[PDB]
Each structure stands twice: as C-alpha cells, then as structure tokens.
Design an enzyme around this catalytic site. Structure first.
Site, PDB file in Angstrom:
ATOM      1  N   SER A 142       0.790  -1.223   0.000  1.00  0.00           N
ATOM      2  CA  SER A 142       0.000   0.000   0.000  1.00  0.00           C
ATOM      3  C   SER A 142       0.830   1.285   0.000  1.00  0.00           C
ATOM      4  CB  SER A 142      -0.959   0.020   1.201  1.00  0.00           C
ATOM      5  OG  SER A 142      -0.252   0.270   2.399  1.00  0.00           O
ATOM      6  N   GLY A 160      -2.070  -4.328   1.004  1.00  0.00           N
ATOM      7  CA  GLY A 160      -2.289  -5.544   1.767  1.00  0.00           C
ATOM      8  C   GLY A 160      -1.277  -6.649   1.518  1.00  0.00           C
ATOM      9  N   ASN A 171       3.499  -5.420   5.996  1.00  0.00           N
ATOM     10  CA  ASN A 171       2.268  -6.156   6.255  1.00  0.00           C
ATOM     11  C   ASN A 171       2.535  -7.475   6.979  1.00  0.00           C
ATOM     12  OD1 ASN A 171       0.645  -5.030   3.179  1.00  0.00           O
ATOM     13  ND2 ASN A 171       0.413  -4.293   5.291  1.00  0.00           N
ATOM     14  N   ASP A 184      -5.631   6.506   9.883  1.00  0.00           N
ATOM     15  CA  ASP A 184      -5.060   5.367  10.590  1.00  0.00           C
ATOM     16  C   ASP A 184      -3.663   5.646  11.131  1.00  0.00           C
ATOM     17  OD1 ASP A 184      -3.371   5.273   8.373  1.00  0.00           O
ATOM     18  OD2 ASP A 184      -4.487   3.623   7.425  1.00  0.00           O
ATOM     19  N   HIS A 202      -0.815   5.096   6.821  1.00  0.00           N
ATOM     20  CA  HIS A 202      -0.580   5.383   5.407  1.00  0.00           C
ATOM     21  C   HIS A 202      -0.571   6.862   5.046  1.00  0.00           C
ATOM     22  CE1 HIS A 202      -2.615   1.407   5.779  1.00  0.00           C
ATOM     23  NE2 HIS A 202      -1.640   1.025   4.975  1.00  0.00           N
TER      24      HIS A 202
END
Length: 178
Positions: A10, A43, A72, A153, A156
C-alpha cells in the site's frame, strides 16, 4: 528507455486512492528516460509479492527493482525470520534476472515496543549488506513528521503527501538509476 519495477504494498500502491494518485505514477510522469512500472498491491505481504515476481521480471525485464515489502508481515503468522527469508528470495530472483535490486528500509509502528521492531527493522540492513545492494531510507520517516500528510489510521500517507514522496524518491533514486 530502461524500466524500474516497483514491487511493493500500500505504501507504493496508494492506500484508498487510485494508482494514478500514488507517488509512483507522479514519478513516472516526472521521468520518458526511465519507465516506472508500479507492481504494488495494498495488503500484500512479502510472500504475496514474491509470488508475483516471476511473471513481472519475465514481462517487464526491468533493470532495477525497488523492493518495498514486509510492513504487512505483522499480522500474517510470519516472524521476522520468515520475512527475512522471503525478502532474501526476492533479492536472489532479482539478481538472477540480471536486474539491480534496490531495497527500502521498512519500520513498524511505535506501539510495538522494543524487541519486535528492532528485530523487524534489523532485517533490511542485514540483507542489504548480504547482497551488497542499495538500502534506501524508509520514506515514511519524513512523512510522519507532517500530520497533514497522514491518513486517519496514522499508518498510510494521504493524497497530499504523494507529490512530496515522488520528489523524495526521485532524489534518492537519481544516483542509482544513474
């Protein structure tokens, strides 16, 4: 024109934004002389990335491959040891395809304490030395310093951040892509 393949998650694919908004697309626009192929998927774990590598190398025959994976591998049942081996395989496949692997340092959230983060982060310097390849700094370090460039979040980078990251990457890669 030579091709730079970006194998990432991502952070490179763009989180909750189109690929055209992600920094690799902006970098490609800035670079004619060098084609930037963004083979990133949100992801993706290092393993999922390696699984896609064979087809990508054979299809794009890149000269340089930017590896930005591992972040991840926090909640997938893999330990730093597994992530390390997976990344090792990636670098091998890249070199085997006569391409120069460019590894990017990845760092995990502060809410993980000592031991695990230090262990995770230590993987990159180890591999960079083992294969004698460029180890780019984690670009998110500079992005964290700008709350206005972070999504909700706190993980990112947002749309507004992409232009900065594109410029940052251009400067970091320039000497490497000659």
């Amino acid at each position: 024109a030579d091709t730079l393949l970006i194998l990432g998650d991502s952070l490179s694919a763009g989180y909750r934004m189109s690929a055209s908004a992600a920094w690799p697309a902006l970098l490609n626009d800035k670079w004619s002389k060098t084609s930037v192929v963004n083979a990133s998927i949100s992801g993706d774990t290092s393993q999922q990335g390696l699984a896609r590598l064979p087809a990508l190398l054979k299809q794009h025959q890149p000269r340089w491959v930017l590896v930005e994976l591992g972040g991840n591998d926090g909640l997938r049942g893999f330990q730093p040891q597994q992530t390390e081996q997976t990344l090792r395989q990636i670098l091998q496949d890249v070199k085997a395809a006569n391409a120069e692997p460019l590894l990017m340092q990845i760092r995990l959230p502060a809410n993980y304490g000592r031991r695990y983060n230090e262990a995770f982060s230590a993987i990159y310097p180890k591999l960079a030395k083992e294969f004698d390849v460029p180890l780019l700094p984690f670009f998110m370090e500079e992005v964290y310093l700008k709350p206005q460039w972070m999504q909700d979040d706190g993980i990112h980078p947002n749309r507004d951040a992409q232009p900065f990251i594109a410029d940052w990457m251009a400067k970091q890669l320039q000497p490497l892509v000659n």
